[PDB]
């Protein structure tokens, strides 16, 4: 009837960046004054979100992210969403963010909004596929709605 | 909500200088 | 028809003010046939008012110049706003820091943010910290409901 | 069922272009169960055309290398254009800029651009303004009908 | 209408140098 | 594809 979606986010921790781990994704009511979990026909696990009808889907992720968390190793990540497992990433969802130098502060990163079709047992998580030195994820949200 | 808390958060935040 | 509604500014930068949701004052993007991009919500001029009870996606997109000013760092935390630009969102929540001067332009999205709205919710874009002089060169908020 | 197309480029980068459209080689991005993820609009290897009116979202991400380039700043201002690269789509700029050399990749979304489009439309990411050499290391295009 | 007047635009151009 | 040839890949290191 209504299209299945779920949006599972972290406002409430930071967290460090381990490779192929996915990220900590704790929260599903964003609504300050009403708060009820968003989600219609997903799961979220705690970290990702779980398909359980088939479908064409938009799914994206966002990340705040702070580059500033060493003193002689320039900081950088590249992420994707996975599929399934976190060594499963998707083409087309990676983002990347590099610094040259120490001590630089937040910068944000945002998927695009992927089109994808997805199968029941699914499971859509934010990984980190490659990491230079320590990498400090202020805040991330992942976003799952079908389309068709 | 105050926002102090709520994520993100600078991670730390220098005050406010002339550099030199 | 699902509801819907595209707000955003590309005629005039604007400096970040702390709690001022941003100037949107734009609602026709289609450059051969412009139209306002509005079924059953309002454009306020800094914000969109939902009118149709339901779940929507909203998001915002901030071009932030941050070496516009003499003194660093240059610093700003953006949210959505839900009816008073003091009830922020959490999910919506963004931040960029140079800790030196001399940063140009900066990229911000917000996540495709879902979220259950109600007849009368005003939606803004709304800073919430800000260091130094924090420029927004363009910016723009969207809001579709899932149905 | 609506009209969507998604086009993306994750197999070789690309230095930007004064309105240039970007390379989208790949429409599958489904690992295990490979389909085109196109339903009534075509991909064209550099945009998505439009066949059916109506209302869509359209918006681009972009990975940029800022220091793949022997002079400094490196910057760029980037748009959708509709059926041609200088007839760009208002509120859907982005712009980065580095004034020095410690930045590498840095992240880009537009706003998820809400916009009347008709038959025939051809949506394409375009570089208008470039200072030093920019690195397009990824890029992705969504035009996605809302109904 | 001309792209130098679409939003966004720089803030500034500094004067380009070989780093 | 290996991820090492996913782009993004990080123009240089």
């Known amino acids: ?8 986010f972290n406002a409430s921790a930071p967290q460090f960046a381990s490779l192929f781990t996915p990220l900590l994704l704790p929260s599903v009511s964003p609504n300050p004054n009403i708060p009820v979990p968003v989600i ?12 359980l009808r088939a479908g064409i889907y938009q799914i994206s992720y966002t ?12 900081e950088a990540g590249r992420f994707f969403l996975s599929l399934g497992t976190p060594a ?6 990676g983002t990347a963010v590099r610094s040259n130098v ?9 998927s695009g909004v ?5 199968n029941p047992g699914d ?6 596929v490659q990491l230079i030195g320590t990498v400090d994820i202020r805040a991330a949200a992942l976003t799952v709605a079908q389309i068709s | 909500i105050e926002p ?5 958060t600078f991670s730390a935040l220098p005050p406010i200088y002339i550099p030199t």
């Not at chain 1, 992927?114 to 997805?118: D, K, T, V």
């Open chain 1, 1 to 8: 009837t209504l299209p299945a979606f779920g949006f599972a």
């Open chain 1, 40 to 51: 219609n026909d997903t799961v979220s696990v705690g970290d990702g979100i779980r398909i």
């Open chain 1, 63 to 74: 990340l705040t992210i702070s580059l500033d968390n060493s003193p002689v190793a320039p």
């Open chain 1, 88 to 93: 499963n990433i998707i083409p087309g969802s």
């Open chain 1, 102 to 110: 120490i001590g630089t502060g937040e910068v944000d990163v945002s």
């Open chain 1, 114 to 118: 992927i089109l994808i079709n997805l």
């Open chain 1, 123 to 128: 499971l859509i998580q934010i990984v980190p």
């Open chain 2, 4 to 8: 102090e808390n709520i994520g993100p």
